[PDB]
CSV table of C-alpha atoms and ligand atoms in Angstrom, one decimal:
chain,number,residue,atom,x,y,z
O,1,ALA,CA,15.8,5.7,-31.7
O,2,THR,CA,14.9,2.3,-33.3
O,3,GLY,CA,18.4,2.3,-34.8
O,4,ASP,CA,20.3,2.5,-31.5
O,5,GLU,CA,18.0,-0.1,-30.0
O,6,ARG,CA,18.9,-2.8,-32.6
O,7,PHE,CA,22.6,-2.0,-32.6
O,8,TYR,CA,22.9,-2.4,-28.9
O,9,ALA,CA,20.7,-5.5,-28.7
O,10,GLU,CA,22.2,-7.3,-31.6
O,11,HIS,CA,25.9,-6.2,-31.6
O,12,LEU,CA,27.2,-4.0,-28.8
O,13,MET,CA,25.7,-5.8,-25.7
O,14,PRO,CA,26.5,-9.3,-27.0
O,15,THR,CA,30.1,-8.2,-27.7
O,16,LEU,CA,30.6,-6.6,-24.2
O,17,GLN,CA,29.2,-9.7,-22.6
O,18,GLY,CA,31.7,-11.8,-24.6
O,19,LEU,CA,34.6,-9.7,-23.4
O,20,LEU,CA,33.7,-8.9,-19.8
O,21,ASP,CA,32.5,-10.9,-16.8
O,22,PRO,CA,29.2,-9.5,-15.5
O,23,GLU,CA,30.7,-7.7,-12.4
O,24,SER,CA,33.3,-6.0,-14.6
O,25,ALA,CA,30.6,-5.1,-17.1
O,26,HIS,CA,28.5,-3.6,-14.3
O,27,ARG,CA,31.4,-1.5,-13.1
O,28,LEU,CA,32.1,-0.2,-16.6
O,29,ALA,CA,28.4,0.6,-17.1
O,30,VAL,CA,28.3,2.6,-13.9
O,31,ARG,CA,31.4,4.5,-14.9
O,32,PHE,CA,30.2,5.3,-18.4
O,33,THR,CA,26.9,6.3,-17.1
O,34,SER,CA,28.4,8.6,-14.4
O,35,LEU,CA,30.4,10.3,-17.1
O,36,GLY,CA,27.3,10.8,-19.3
O,37,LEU,CA,28.8,8.7,-22.1
O,38,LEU,CA,25.3,7.7,-23.4
O,39,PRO,CA,23.2,7.6,-26.5
O,40,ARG,CA,21.3,10.5,-25.0
O,41,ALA,CA,17.6,9.7,-25.0
O,42,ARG,CA,15.7,11.2,-28.0
O,43,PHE,CA,12.3,10.2,-26.6
O,44,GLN,CA,10.4,13.3,-25.3
O,45,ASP,CA,8.1,12.3,-22.4
O,46,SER,CA,4.5,12.9,-23.2
O,47,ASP,CA,1.9,14.1,-20.7
O,48,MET,CA,0.1,10.8,-20.6
O,49,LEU,CA,3.2,9.2,-19.0
O,50,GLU,CA,3.1,11.6,-16.0
O,51,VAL,CA,2.2,10.1,-12.6
O,52,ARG,CA,1.5,11.9,-9.3
O,53,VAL,CA,2.1,9.6,-6.3
O,54,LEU,CA,4.1,9.4,-3.1
O,55,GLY,CA,3.8,13.2,-2.8
O,56,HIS,CA,5.6,13.8,-6.0
O,57,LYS,CA,5.3,14.2,-9.8
O,58,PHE,CA,7.0,11.6,-11.9
O,59,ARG,CA,7.6,12.8,-15.5
O,60,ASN,CA,7.4,9.1,-16.7
O,61,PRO,CA,6.8,5.9,-14.7
O,62,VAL,CA,10.0,4.0,-15.6
O,63,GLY,CA,12.7,4.0,-13.0
O,64,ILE,CA,16.0,2.3,-12.4
O,65,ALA,CA,15.8,-0.4,-9.7
O,66,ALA,CA,18.0,-0.6,-6.7
O,67,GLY,CA,21.4,-2.3,-7.1
O,68,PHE,CA,22.6,-0.8,-10.3
O,69,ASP,CA,23.9,2.4,-8.6
O,70,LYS,CA,24.5,1.0,-5.2
O,71,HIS,CA,26.6,3.9,-4.0
O,72,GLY,CA,25.0,7.0,-5.6
O,73,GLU,CA,27.7,7.5,-8.3
O,74,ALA,CA,25.7,7.7,-11.5
O,75,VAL,CA,22.4,9.5,-10.6
O,76,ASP,CA,22.6,12.3,-13.1
O,77,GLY,CA,23.7,9.9,-15.9
O,78,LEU,CA,20.7,7.8,-15.1
O,79,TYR,CA,18.3,10.7,-15.6
O,80,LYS,CA,20.1,11.4,-18.8
O,81,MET,CA,19.3,7.8,-19.9
O,82,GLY,CA,15.6,8.8,-19.6
O,83,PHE,CA,14.5,7.2,-16.3
O,84,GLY,CA,11.6,9.1,-14.6
O,85,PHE,CA,13.1,8.4,-11.2
O,86,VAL,CA,16.3,6.9,-9.8
O,87,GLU,CA,16.7,4.6,-6.8
O,88,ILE,CA,20.2,4.1,-5.3
O,89,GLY,CA,21.4,1.5,-2.8
O,90,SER,CA,21.1,-0.7,-1.0
O,91,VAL,CA,23.3,1.4,1.4
O,92,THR,CA,24.5,-0.2,4.7
O,93,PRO,CA,25.4,1.9,7.8
O,94,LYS,CA,29.1,1.0,7.7
O,95,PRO,CA,31.1,0.1,4.6
O,96,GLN,CA,31.3,-3.5,3.8
O,97,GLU,CA,32.7,-5.6,0.9
O,98,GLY,CA,30.0,-8.1,0.3
O,99,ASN,CA,30.5,-11.7,-0.7
O,100,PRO,CA,33.6,-13.1,-2.4
O,101,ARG,CA,33.8,-13.2,-6.2
O,102,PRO,CA,32.4,-14.5,-8.4
O,103,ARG,CA,29.0,-13.3,-7.2
O,104,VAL,CA,27.2,-12.3,-10.4
O,105,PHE,CA,26.2,-14.6,-13.2
O,106,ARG,CA,24.5,-14.2,-16.6
O,107,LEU,CA,21.8,-16.6,-17.9
O,108,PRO,CA,21.6,-15.4,-21.5
O,109,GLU,CA,19.3,-18.3,-22.6
O,110,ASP,CA,16.8,-17.1,-20.0
O,111,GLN,CA,17.4,-13.3,-20.2
O,112,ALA,CA,18.2,-13.6,-16.5
O,113,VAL,CA,20.9,-12.8,-14.0
O,114,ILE,CA,21.7,-14.5,-10.7
O,115,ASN,CA,23.5,-12.4,-8.1
O,116,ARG,CA,24.8,-12.8,-4.5
O,117,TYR,CA,26.6,-9.5,-4.0
O,118,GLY,CA,25.7,-9.5,-0.3
O,119,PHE,CA,25.2,-5.7,0.1
O,120,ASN,CA,28.6,-4.5,-1.0
O,121,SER,CA,28.3,-0.8,0.1
O,122,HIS,CA,30.5,2.3,0.5
O,123,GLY,CA,28.4,3.0,3.6
O,124,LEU,CA,26.1,5.8,4.7
O,125,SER,CA,28.8,8.5,5.3
O,126,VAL,CA,30.3,8.2,1.8
O,127,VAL,CA,26.9,8.2,0.1
O,128,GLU,CA,25.7,11.1,2.4
O,129,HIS,CA,28.5,13.3,1.2
O,130,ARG,CA,28.0,12.2,-2.5
O,131,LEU,CA,24.3,13.2,-2.4
O,132,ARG,CA,25.1,16.4,-0.4
O,133,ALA,CA,27.3,17.5,-3.3
O,134,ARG,CA,24.3,17.6,-5.6
O,135,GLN,CA,21.5,18.2,-3.1
O,136,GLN,CA,20.2,21.4,-4.6
O,137,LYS,CA,20.5,20.1,-8.2
O,138,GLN,CA,18.3,17.1,-7.0
O,139,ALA,CA,15.8,19.5,-5.5
O,140,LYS,CA,15.3,21.1,-8.9
O,141,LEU,CA,15.2,17.7,-10.6
O,142,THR,CA,12.5,16.5,-8.2
O,143,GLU,CA,10.5,19.7,-8.7
O,144,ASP,CA,10.8,19.0,-12.5
O,145,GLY,CA,9.3,15.6,-12.0
O,146,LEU,CA,12.5,13.4,-11.5
O,147,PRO,CA,12.5,12.1,-8.0
O,148,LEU,CA,15.2,10.3,-6.1
O,149,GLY,CA,14.8,7.2,-3.9
O,150,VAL,CA,17.3,5.7,-1.4
O,151,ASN,CA,17.2,2.0,-0.6
O,152,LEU,CA,18.5,1.1,2.9
O,153,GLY,CA,20.2,-2.1,4.0
O,154,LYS,CA,21.8,-3.5,7.1
O,155,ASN,CA,25.3,-4.7,7.8
O,156,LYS,CA,26.2,-8.4,7.8
O,157,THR,CA,27.4,-8.3,11.5
O,158,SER,CA,24.5,-6.1,12.7
O,159,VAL,CA,23.1,-7.2,16.0
O,160,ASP,CA,19.9,-5.0,15.8
O,161,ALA,CA,18.5,-4.6,12.3
O,162,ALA,CA,16.0,-1.9,13.3
O,163,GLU,CA,18.9,0.3,14.5
O,164,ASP,CA,20.7,-0.1,11.1
O,165,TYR,CA,17.6,1.0,9.3
O,166,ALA,CA,17.0,3.8,11.8
O,167,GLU,CA,20.5,5.1,11.2
O,168,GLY,CA,19.8,5.1,7.4
O,169,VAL,CA,16.7,7.1,7.9
O,170,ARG,CA,18.5,9.7,9.9
O,171,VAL,CA,21.5,10.0,7.6
O,172,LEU,CA,20.0,9.6,4.1
O,173,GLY,CA,16.3,10.4,4.8
O,174,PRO,CA,16.9,14.1,4.5
O,175,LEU,CA,18.4,13.6,1.0
O,176,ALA,CA,15.7,11.4,-0.4
O,177,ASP,CA,12.3,11.8,-1.9
O,178,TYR,CA,11.5,8.3,-0.7
O,179,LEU,CA,13.2,5.6,1.4
O,180,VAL,CA,13.0,1.9,0.9
O,181,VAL,CA,13.2,-0.6,3.7
O,182,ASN,CA,14.7,-3.5,2.0
O,183,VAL,CA,13.8,-6.6,4.0
O,184,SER,CA,13.9,-8.9,1.0
O,185,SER,CA,17.5,-9.4,-0.1
O,186,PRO,CA,18.1,-13.1,-0.5
O,187,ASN,CA,21.8,-12.6,0.2
O,188,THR,CA,22.0,-11.5,3.9
O,189,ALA,CA,21.4,-14.2,6.5
O,190,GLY,CA,18.2,-13.6,8.5
O,191,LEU,CA,17.1,-10.5,6.5
O,192,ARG,CA,14.0,-11.8,4.9
O,193,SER,CA,12.6,-13.1,8.3
O,194,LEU,CA,12.2,-9.3,9.0
O,195,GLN,CA,9.1,-9.7,6.8
O,196,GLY,CA,7.3,-11.7,9.5
O,197,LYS,CA,4.5,-9.8,11.3
O,198,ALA,CA,5.8,-9.2,14.9
O,199,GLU,CA,9.3,-8.4,13.6
O,200,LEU,CA,8.0,-6.2,10.8
O,201,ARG,CA,5.6,-4.1,12.9
O,202,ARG,CA,8.4,-3.4,15.5
O,203,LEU,CA,10.9,-2.6,12.7
O,204,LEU,CA,8.6,-0.4,10.7
O,205,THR,CA,7.3,1.4,13.7
O,206,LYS,CA,10.8,2.5,14.6
O,207,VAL,CA,11.6,3.5,11.0
O,208,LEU,CA,8.5,5.6,10.7
O,209,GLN,CA,9.2,7.3,14.1
O,210,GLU,CA,12.6,8.3,12.9
O,211,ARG,CA,11.2,9.5,9.6
O,212,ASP,CA,8.5,11.6,11.3
O,213,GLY,CA,11.3,13.2,13.4
O,214,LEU,CA,12.8,14.8,10.3
O,215,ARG,CA,12.1,18.4,9.3
O,216,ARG,CA,9.2,18.8,6.9
O,217,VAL,CA,11.1,19.6,3.7
O,218,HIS,CA,13.5,16.7,4.5
O,219,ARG,CA,10.8,14.1,5.3
O,220,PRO,CA,10.7,11.3,2.8
O,221,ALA,CA,8.0,8.7,1.9
O,222,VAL,CA,8.8,5.3,3.3
O,223,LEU,CA,8.3,2.1,1.2
O,224,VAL,CA,8.8,-1.6,2.0
O,225,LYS,CA,10.4,-3.8,-0.6
O,226,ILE,CA,9.3,-7.4,-0.5
O,227,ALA,CA,10.4,-10.7,-2.0
O,228,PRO,CA,8.5,-12.7,-4.6
O,229,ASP,CA,8.9,-15.8,-2.4
O,230,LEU,CA,6.4,-15.0,0.4
O,231,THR,CA,3.7,-17.3,1.6
O,232,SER,CA,0.1,-16.2,1.3
O,233,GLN,CA,0.3,-15.8,5.1
O,234,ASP,CA,3.3,-13.5,4.8
O,235,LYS,CA,1.6,-11.3,2.2
O,236,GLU,CA,-1.6,-11.0,4.4
O,237,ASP,CA,0.6,-10.0,7.4
O,238,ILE,CA,2.6,-7.4,5.4
O,239,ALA,CA,-0.6,-5.9,4.0
O,240,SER,CA,-2.1,-5.7,7.4
O,241,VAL,CA,1.0,-4.0,9.0
O,242,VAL,CA,1.4,-1.6,6.1
O,243,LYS,CA,-2.2,-0.4,6.5
O,244,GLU,CA,-2.0,-0.3,10.3
O,245,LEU,CA,1.1,1.9,10.3
O,246,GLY,CA,0.5,4.1,7.3
O,247,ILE,CA,3.5,2.9,5.3
O,248,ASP,CA,3.5,5.0,2.1
O,249,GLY,CA,4.1,2.3,-0.4
O,250,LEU,CA,5.5,-1.1,-1.5
O,251,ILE,CA,8.2,-2.1,-4.0
O,252,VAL,CA,7.2,-5.4,-5.5
O,253,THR,CA,9.5,-7.3,-6.1
O,254,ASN,CA,13.1,-8.1,-5.2
O,255,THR,CA,14.8,-11.1,-6.8
O,256,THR,CA,13.7,-14.7,-6.3
O,257,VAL,CA,15.5,-17.6,-4.6
O,258,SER,CA,13.2,-19.9,-6.5
O,259,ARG,CA,14.3,-21.5,-9.7
O,260,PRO,CA,11.3,-21.7,-12.0
O,261,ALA,CA,11.1,-24.9,-14.1
O,262,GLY,CA,12.6,-24.5,-17.6
O,263,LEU,CA,15.7,-22.4,-16.9
O,264,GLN,CA,18.3,-23.2,-19.5
O,265,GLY,CA,21.3,-21.2,-18.4
O,266,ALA,CA,24.3,-23.3,-17.4
O,267,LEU,CA,24.6,-21.2,-14.2
O,268,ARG,CA,21.0,-21.7,-13.1
O,269,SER,CA,22.0,-23.6,-9.9
O,270,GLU,CA,24.3,-20.8,-8.6
O,271,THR,CA,23.2,-19.5,-5.2
O,272,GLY,CA,21.6,-16.0,-5.2
O,273,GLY,CA,18.6,-14.0,-6.4
O,274,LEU,CA,17.3,-14.5,-9.9
O,275,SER,CA,16.2,-11.5,-11.9
O,276,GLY,CA,15.0,-10.8,-15.4
O,277,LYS,CA,12.4,-12.6,-17.5
O,278,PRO,CA,11.9,-15.7,-15.3
O,279,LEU,CA,10.9,-13.4,-12.5
O,280,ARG,CA,8.4,-11.3,-14.6
O,281,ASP,CA,5.1,-12.9,-14.0
O,282,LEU,CA,5.9,-14.0,-10.5
O,283,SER,CA,6.4,-10.3,-9.7
O,284,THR,CA,3.3,-9.3,-11.6
O,285,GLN,CA,1.2,-11.7,-9.6
O,286,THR,CA,2.7,-10.5,-6.3
O,287,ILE,CA,1.7,-6.9,-7.4
O,288,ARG,CA,-1.8,-8.1,-8.2
O,289,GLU,CA,-2.1,-9.8,-4.8
O,290,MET,CA,-0.7,-6.9,-2.7
O,291,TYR,CA,-2.9,-4.3,-4.5
O,292,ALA,CA,-6.0,-6.4,-3.7
O,293,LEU,CA,-4.9,-6.9,-0.1
O,294,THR,CA,-4.4,-3.2,0.4
O,295,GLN,CA,-7.6,-2.2,-1.5
O,296,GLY,CA,-5.7,-0.3,-4.0
O,297,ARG,CA,-4.9,2.4,-1.4
O,298,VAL,CA,-1.2,1.7,-1.1
O,299,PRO,CA,1.1,2.8,-4.0
O,300,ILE,CA,3.1,0.0,-5.6
O,301,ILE,CA,6.3,0.3,-7.5
O,302,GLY,CA,6.4,-2.8,-9.7
O,303,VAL,CA,9.6,-4.5,-10.7
O,304,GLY,CA,10.9,-7.7,-12.1
O,305,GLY,CA,11.5,-8.8,-15.7
O,306,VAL,CA,10.4,-5.6,-17.4
O,307,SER,CA,11.9,-5.0,-20.9
O,308,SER,CA,8.9,-3.8,-23.0
O,309,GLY,CA,5.9,-1.6,-22.9
O,310,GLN,CA,3.7,-4.7,-22.6
O,311,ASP,CA,5.7,-5.8,-19.5
O,312,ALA,CA,5.3,-2.4,-17.9
O,313,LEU,CA,1.6,-2.1,-18.7
O,314,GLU,CA,0.9,-5.6,-17.3
O,315,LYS,CA,2.4,-4.5,-14.0
O,316,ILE,CA,0.5,-1.1,-14.1
O,317,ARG,CA,-2.8,-2.8,-14.8
O,318,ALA,CA,-2.1,-5.3,-12.0
O,319,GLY,CA,-1.8,-2.4,-9.6
O,320,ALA,CA,1.6,-0.7,-10.0
O,321,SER,CA,1.7,3.1,-10.1
O,322,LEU,CA,5.3,3.1,-11.2
O,323,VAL,CA,7.7,0.4,-12.6
O,324,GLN,CA,11.4,-0.2,-12.4
O,325,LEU,CA,13.9,-2.3,-14.4
O,326,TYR,CA,17.5,-3.4,-14.1
O,327,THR,CA,18.3,-6.7,-15.7
O,328,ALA,CA,16.9,-5.6,-19.1
O,329,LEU,CA,19.9,-3.1,-19.3
O,330,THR,CA,22.2,-6.1,-19.2
O,331,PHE,CA,20.8,-7.5,-22.4
O,332,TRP,CA,19.4,-4.4,-24.3
O,333,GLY,CA,21.6,-1.6,-22.9
O,334,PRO,CA,20.5,2.1,-22.4
O,335,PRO,CA,18.1,2.1,-25.4
O,336,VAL,CA,15.7,-0.1,-23.5
O,337,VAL,CA,14.5,2.8,-21.5
O,338,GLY,CA,13.2,4.8,-24.5
O,339,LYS,CA,11.8,1.5,-25.9
O,340,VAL,CA,9.7,0.8,-22.9
O,341,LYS,CA,8.4,4.4,-22.7
O,342,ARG,CA,7.5,4.5,-26.4
O,343,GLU,CA,5.8,1.1,-26.4
O,344,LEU,CA,4.0,1.9,-23.2
O,345,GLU,CA,2.6,5.1,-24.6
O,346,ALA,CA,1.4,3.3,-27.8
O,347,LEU,CA,-0.3,0.6,-25.8
O,348,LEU,CA,-2.1,3.0,-23.5
O,349,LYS,CA,-3.5,4.7,-26.6
O,350,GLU,CA,-4.5,1.3,-28.1
O,351,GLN,CA,-6.3,0.2,-25.0
O,352,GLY,CA,-8.2,3.5,-24.6
O,353,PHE,CA,-6.4,4.8,-21.5
O,354,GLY,CA,-6.1,8.6,-21.2
O,355,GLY,CA,-2.8,8.1,-19.5
O,356,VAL,CA,-0.8,5.9,-17.1
O,357,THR,CA,-3.0,7.0,-14.2
O,358,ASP,CA,-6.1,5.6,-15.8
O,359,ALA,CA,-4.5,2.2,-16.2
O,360,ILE,CA,-3.3,1.7,-12.6
O,361,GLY,CA,-5.1,-1.3,-11.2
O,362,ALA,CA,-7.4,-1.5,-14.2
O,363,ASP,CA,-7.4,-5.4,-14.2
O,364,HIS,CA,-9.2,-5.3,-10.8
O,365,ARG,CA,-12.1,-3.2,-12.2
V,1,LIG,C1,23.0,-7.4,-9.7
V,1,LIG,C2,21.8,-7.0,-8.9
V,1,LIG,C3,21.9,-6.3,-7.8
V,1,LIG,C4,20.8,-5.9,-7.0
V,1,LIG,N1,21.0,-5.2,-5.8
V,1,LIG,C5,19.9,-4.8,-5.1
V,1,LIG,C6,20.0,-4.0,-3.9
V,1,LIG,O1,21.1,-3.7,-3.5
V,1,LIG,N2,18.9,-3.7,-3.2
V,1,LIG,C7,17.6,-4.0,-3.7
V,1,LIG,O2,16.6,-3.7,-3.0
V,1,LIG,N3,17.5,-4.7,-4.8
V,1,LIG,C8,18.6,-5.1,-5.6
V,1,LIG,N4,18.4,-5.8,-6.7
V,1,LIG,C9,17.0,-6.2,-7.2
V,1,LIG,C10,16.5,-5.2,-8.2
V,1,LIG,O3,16.3,-4.0,-7.6
V,1,LIG,C11,15.1,-5.7,-8.7
V,1,LIG,O4,14.2,-5.7,-7.6
V,1,LIG,C12,15.2,-7.1,-9.4
V,1,LIG,O5,16.5,-7.3,-10.0
V,1,LIG,C13,14.1,-7.3,-10.4
V,1,LIG,O6,14.1,-6.4,-11.4
V,1,LIG,P1,14.7,-6.8,-12.9
V,1,LIG,O7,14.2,-8.2,-13.2
V,1,LIG,O8,14.3,-5.7,-13.8
V,1,LIG,O9,16.3,-6.9,-12.7
V,1,LIG,C14,19.5,-6.2,-7.5
V,1,LIG,C15,19.4,-6.9,-8.7
V,1,LIG,C16,20.5,-7.3,-9.4
V,1,LIG,C17,20.3,-8.1,-10.7
V,2,LIG,O1,26.1,-8.9,-17.0
V,2,LIG,C1,25.9,-7.7,-16.9
V,2,LIG,C2,25.5,-7.1,-15.5
V,2,LIG,C3,25.2,-7.9,-14.4
V,2,LIG,C4,24.8,-7.4,-13.2
V,2,LIG,C5,24.7,-6.0,-13.0
V,2,LIG,C6,24.9,-5.2,-14.1
V,2,LIG,C7,25.3,-5.7,-15.4
V,2,LIG,C8,25.5,-4.8,-16.5
V,2,LIG,O2,25.4,-3.6,-16.5
V,2,LIG,C9,26.0,-5.3,-17.8
V,2,LIG,C10,26.2,-6.7,-18.0
V,2,LIG,N1,26.6,-6.9,-19.3
V,2,LIG,N2,26.6,-5.8,-19.9
V,2,LIG,N3,26.3,-4.8,-19.1
V,2,LIG,C11,26.3,-3.4,-19.5
V,2,LIG,C12,27.4,-2.8,-20.1
V,2,LIG,C13,27.4,-1.4,-20.5
V,2,LIG,F1,28.5,-1.0,-21.0
V,2,LIG,C14,26.3,-0.6,-20.4
V,2,LIG,C15,26.3,0.8,-20.9
V,2,LIG,C16,26.1,1.9,-20.0
V,2,LIG,C17,26.1,3.2,-20.5
V,2,LIG,C18,26.4,3.5,-21.8
V,2,LIG,C19,26.7,2.4,-22.7
V,2,LIG,C20,26.6,1.1,-22.2
V,2,LIG,F2,26.9,0.1,-23.1
V,2,LIG,C21,25.2,-1.2,-19.8
V,2,LIG,F3,24.1,-0.5,-19.7
V,2,LIG,C22,25.2,-2.6,-19.4
V,3,LIG,C1,5.1,-19.6,-14.3
V,3,LIG,C2,6.6,-19.8,-14.0
V,3,LIG,C3,7.4,-19.3,-15.1
V,3,LIG,C4,8.8,-19.1,-14.8
V,3,LIG,C5,9.5,-18.0,-15.7
V,3,LIG,C6,8.8,-17.7,-17.1
V,3,LIG,C7,9.7,-17.2,-18.2
V,3,LIG,C8,8.9,-16.9,-19.4
V,3,LIG,C9,9.8,-16.8,-20.7
V,3,LIG,C10,9.8,-15.5,-21.5
V,3,LIG,C11,11.2,-14.8,-21.5
V,3,LIG,C12,11.8,-14.5,-22.9
V,3,LIG,N1,13.2,-15.1,-23.1
V,3,LIG,C13,14.0,-14.4,-24.2
V,3,LIG,C14,14.1,-14.7,-21.9
V,3,LIG,O1,13.3,-16.4,-23.2
V,4,LIG,O1,23.4,-7.0,-2.6
V,4,LIG,C1,22.9,-8.0,-3.0
V,4,LIG,O2,23.2,-9.2,-3.1
V,4,LIG,C2,21.3,-7.9,-3.3
V,4,LIG,C3,20.5,-7.2,-2.5
V,4,LIG,C4,19.0,-7.2,-2.9
V,4,LIG,O3,18.2,-6.6,-2.2
V,4,LIG,N1,18.6,-8.0,-3.9
V,4,LIG,C5,19.4,-8.8,-4.7
V,4,LIG,O4,19.1,-9.5,-5.7
V,4,LIG,N2,20.9,-8.7,-4.3
V,5,LIG,NA1,17.6,17.1,-2.6
V,6,LIG,NA1,11.0,15.2,1.0
V,7,LIG,NA1,0.6,-19.3,3.7
């Protein structure tokens, strides 16, 4: 356990980073993971990490965020890594290549990444068939407390965003425990303006109509993923629409187009979304705000800069029922998953919580 953690963090990951540009490193990571070539997680999930939310049981509250497995190629390997749930995507209706390279950048001095992938996607049809090939295996995983989420995007040339998301609901909704309407990528022109009130109500109404039209056992929860860069007005409007329409949850947050003071990485002024540690507290505060605006009645998946049990528990106490991580894998590798879970369990005990559930939103009380 603690042996693998130090080796990866101090030797293997720094060496890989020295050899491989970040996009190549990412592709290698997906390949190894899909093949199960992993220091298989020794951490056994205890009962106090279990969470019931979004109509499902989650064996532990630590998931892999969207964007690592964009095309649904490494799902089983990710459960093997110890994640309590997996989110794939973003997936666009038609295949598209995304932005020209280079489009991913490491900021090691900041434990951050900047990316401008631009929704590179194999498309709905390819991902549909990939998930169908393991659909019953996933049904059993979900029943055993390991749910699957699918994050939906829209094509660059799309004339009608709502129809792109609707198509995603129809094609991948039946294969997902939850769907994510990603209106917060900073790398698709016009996308984030879908977060405005009039736009958003129309868009989410259509999405929910399509979802409701699926057969009961194929009917996923629907969540909205938002940016950390919203005005107070934007956040109020999103909270209002979410409650009005009965949206099932929020994912808080995507990457930031802001550049917090103090970044040291040479590549800090590259265009794209910033992730990792400089995002952490901006994300946590957005969780805190959205939880209060929704009166704690709308489940939140908290994400941004998590690499320790403390980071996870801060988001949980701020209002998150579940958390996700991605960028920490860059710097710590696969052992970071067991690390976060072990540290989270220890902190829950230290602070007198019976389990994760007791800690959700605790700062507000
Ligand atoms: C390289 C990269 C690609 C990403 N791609 C997506 C994506 O396709 N869809 C999405 O909703 N979020 C995407 N994200 C955002 C992550 O899901 C997450 O919200 C964000 O990175 C903050 O978490 P982290 O600090 O633990 O990385 C991506 C992030 C990174 C770093
Ligand atoms: O810079 C990035 C970066 C940027 C933007 C998205 C993603 C990545 C990224 O995955 C990455 C980066 N640098 N190293 N990795 C990296 C390399 C690996 F080999 C693994 C791995 C996986 C399974 C078993 C053993 C391992 F070692 C891993 F988890 C992460
Ligand atoms: C309030 C705005 C702050 C912007 C971002 C804050 C980053 C905090 C630094 C802790 C990260 C740890 N490390 C190794 C990456 O330096
Ligand atoms: O594909 C990308 O560029 C991307 C999508 C998203 O939602 N977030 C992010 O940081 N990048
Ligand atoms: Na399934
Ligand atoms: Na379902
Ligand atoms: Na405002």
